[PDB]
Structure formats: C-alpha cells, structure tokens
Amino acid sequence: MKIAIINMGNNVINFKTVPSSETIYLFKVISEMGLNVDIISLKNGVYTKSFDEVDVNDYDRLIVVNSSINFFGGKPNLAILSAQKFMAKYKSKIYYLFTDIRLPFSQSWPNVKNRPWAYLYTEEELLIKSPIKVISQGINLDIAKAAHKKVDNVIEFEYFPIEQYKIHMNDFQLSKPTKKTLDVIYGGSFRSGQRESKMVEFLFDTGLNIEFFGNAREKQFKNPKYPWTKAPVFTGKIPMNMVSEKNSQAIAALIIGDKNYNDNFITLRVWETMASDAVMLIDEEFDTKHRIINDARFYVNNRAELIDRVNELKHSDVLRKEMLSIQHDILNKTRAKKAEWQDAFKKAIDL
C-alpha cells in the first residue's frame, strides 16, 4: 500500500507558505497513522519527490489537496499544470480533499485552451478522466455536490473532518498562558469578500483593540453593503505553524465562516483557536446548535454582544481562565478520539 499526496495548484517545499504547510501536515498525519506516503511536487526537496521522477501509477492511492486552478499574469503556472498532467496519467480513483468551499475540483483545460500559451499543452495531456471521490470537510454533501455539478467524473462524496489534523499531530501542544497585548484577534485572508459582512460586523467599529493578521488589507473592504468608519489593525501574514501562538496574544479570538460553512464546516481556525491561550468567541450563526462547545458564553450574536463578552473577560480574569479551561478540556475530549478519526480517514480512502 503506497500512497501519493499532491497539492493541485501550489508548490510544496516547507512551512514558509500555507498551501505547502497544509500539504506537509497532511503528509505527516497520514504517515503518523502507519501509512506509507510520499508528497509529489515540482521538484525534489526535504518532503517531496518530483512529478518528473516518479510514476503516478506506482501508487495505490492518489490523494489531492484542493486548490484554485486560475491563471494570472504571464508564464504558465506549472504548479497547476504539472499537477493535472500527473493526475491525468493516473488510472485509478482520485481522492480529492475538499477543505475550502471555493476550491472544488475543476478541469484546467477549459481555462488553458484559450490562453496565448495554450499551444504548449493538449487536452489529452491535461484532461483528467479517472473517477473522483470528494472527501468533504463539510457535513452537508449537497453543498459539496452543487460545487462540483460541472464535473462529470466526480462520482462519490463522503464527509470527513479533515481539518482535525492540527490537533492529532504527535507533537501537538496547547498554548501556554501569554501576556496579552490585544482584545480580539483574527487571522486569515479576504477570501475574495465571501465573508466581508461578518468581518465588518465583528472586527470593525468595536472600539476595542483588534488585530486582523494574514493576507487581508484594509483597502479591500469597500463593499457599499457593509460600511465602516474605524478598521482593526492589519498586520502581515505569518507561518501556519505559528498561528496558535499568534492567537494567544489576544484575550479572545473570533470564529466566523462563509455562509455555506455555517452549521456545516468546522474549520482549522476552530482548533487553532481552541488550542490557543485566547478565549474562542463564535458567531452564533456559524454554530447555531452550539455543537463546538455547549456553553453560551462562547457565542456572540452580533457586534454588541462581542463587545460585551470581551469586556467581561477583561474585567474578570477568573471568568477568562475558567472559559479557557473549559475549551481546553473539550479540545482534549476530541483528541481522545484520535483512533476513531484515523480509522475514519482510512475508510474514506478505501483502506
């Protein structure tokens, strides 16, 4: 049983980039459950083998981390093209890890054939014909199926909480008490404005000391539907393996998601935040049944409640430590189910 895992549209080298980090984390967690796996990328490296130096069909299972397939600028993006060429040569079922609703599996050919550099490729070379099984991070498979209604060879769908890999790593460790320098913090990208309403609601015009770290920038928030006056402080992006440490700088950290994530996806940030020294405050709409933590104090319905809850935490260190103890306890309860999670992953990839 030999497994190959690849990222469909981003180069993989180390933890200096997010897509690379995620692919390496998956490689590691799969390896930690006793499976033989190789990461195949553009070139050889610490964690990778090159597409040009291995036969994709020497592997019994091909796992693909979702990615965008859009082309921008000049030169052809080999990260996308070489990955799809590799996939097109595989003669068995492909397991597509669908962790981001905006990144459903799609054929690159249609987006290539009209490019000025289209002559460098052929349809037969890029057209992926193997059957594809989508492993959905969201429990709602209808949302996952709708996202792939445009691809005929995607014939199977199964839900699996992929994102829990963060808490199941052998070297996992909870963040320790940290000196606070922020009231609220949130790390992420602008996500093409797919979450602008929630970002403005909970992070803007709060009167609190809020930091928004990641690829997002103040100048991106200009939708007339969600006006604001005072924005949070935007700082640069940081390595994925430093996120919980970063969240720990704040008293509380925000949990929001895209509309289609509500009561559907449990994202990586839920675990990165739960494991941090920051109290997790969740948008009521994201988890209406309070399935993450059965304690209403961790949920906020709007800007007003977020402000109230944050001030309550600032005023009472005991309340803050009490809630942190609760979220760390619930986190450990899920970590205690690692065996079940591993077996479910194996089942998802037909092992």
Ligand X SMILES: O=c1ccn([C@@H]2O[C@H](COP(=O)(O)OP(=O)(O)O)[C@@H](O)[C@H]2O)c(=O)[nH]1
Q: Which stretch binds Ca ion (CB under 5 A): 88-96, 127-135, 175-183, 260-268?
A: 260-268
Is 195 a residue of the active site? Answer: no
Element (H, E) at 106: none
The reply to whether 238 sits near ligand X by the rule CB under 6 A is yes
The reply to whether 187 sits near ligand X by the rule CB under 6 A is yes
- Residues 100, 158, 205, 285: which is the catalytic one? 100
Residue 344 binds what, of ligand X, Ca ion, none (CB under 5 to 8 Å, by partner type)? none
Question: Both tokens of residue 83?
Answer: 């990955």
Q: Which of 237, 297, 303, 335 binds ligand X (CB under 6 A)?
A: 237
Query: Would you tell me how many other CB atoms lie within 10 Å of the CB of residue 138?
Result: 22
Q: Which of 162, 268, 313, 324 binds Ca ion (CB under 5 A)?
A: 268
Q: Which of 272, 277, 283, 287 binds ligand X (CB under 6 A)?
A: 272
Q: Cα dist. 300→5, 232, 295, 303 in Å? A: 38, 18, 11, 8
Task: Report the candidate in 25, 27, 23 with the shortest Cα–Cα distance to residue 37.
Answer: 27
Task: Report the candidate in 79, 165, 85, 172 with the shortest Cα–Cα distance to residue 129.
Answer: 85
Least distance from ligand X to the Cβ atom of residue 207, Å: 24
Is 191 a residue of the active site? Answer: yes
Is 100 a residue of the active site? Answer: yes
Q: Which of 98, 214, 276, 345 binds ligand X (CB under 6 A)?
A: 214
Q: Can you name the residues that pair with 187 across neighbouring β-strands?
A: 213
- Residues 53, 55, 72, 291: which is the catalytic one? 72
Least distance from ligand X to the Cβ atom of residue 64, Å: 18
Kindly identify the residues of this chain, within the stretch 247-266, that bind ligand X according to CB under 6 A.
Answer: 257
Residue 51 binds what, of ligand X, Ca ion, none (CB under 5 to 8 Å, by partner type)? none
Q: How many helices (H) and strands (E) does the chain have?
A: 12, 13
- Residues 86, 160, 191, 283: which is the catalytic one? 191
For Ca ion, the nearest residue by Cβ is 268
Residues 206-242 as b/e (b if ≥16 CB within 10 A, e otherwise) read bebbbbbbbebeeebbeeeeeebeebbebeeeeebee
Residue 161 binds what, of Ca ion, ligand X, none (CB under 5 to 8 Å, by partner type)? none
Alpha helix positions (H), 72-140: 78-89, 109-112, 123-126
Distance, in Å, from the CA atom of 6 to the CA atom of 136, rounded to the nearest integer, reads 17
Distance, in Å, from the CA atom of 104 to the CA atom of 134, rounded to the nearest integer, reads 9
Asked if residue 210 lies in contact with residue 203, where contact means CB atoms within 8 angstroms, the answer is yes
Distance, in Å, from the CA atom of 73 to the CA atom of 180, rounded to the nearest integer, reads 42
Residue 237 binds what, of Ca ion, ligand X, none (CB under 5 to 8 Å, by partner type)? ligand X
Q: Which stretch binds ligand X (CB under 6 A): 6-14, 47-55, 116-124, 236-244?
A: 236-244
Element (H, E) at 347: helix 338-348
Residue 214 binds what, of ligand X, Ca ion, none (CB under 5 to 8 Å, by partner type)? ligand X
DSSP annotation of 259:
G
How would you class 74 by CB atoms within 10 Å of its CB: exposed for 0-12, middle for 13-18, buried for 19 or more?
Answer: exposed
Least distance from ligand X to the Cβ atom of residue 237, Å: 4
**Number of residues forming the site for Ca ion (CB under 5 A):** 1
Least distance from Ca ion to the Cβ atom of residue 123, Å: 32
Least distance from ligand X to the Cβ atom of residue 213, Å: 5
Q: Which is nearer to ligand X, 182 or 240 (CB)?
A: 240
The reply to whether 220 sits near ligand X by the rule CB under 6 A is no
**Number of residues forming the site for ligand X (CB under 6 A):** 16
Is 22 a residue of the active site? Answer: yes
Query: Would you tell me how many other CB atoms lie within 10 Å of the CB of residue 293?
Result: 20
Residues with catalytic function: 22, 72, 100, 191
Report the interface residues with ligand X, using CB under 6 A: 18, 187-189, 191, 213-214, 237-238, 240, 243, 257, 267-269, 272
Report the interface residues with Ca ion, using CB under 5 A: 268
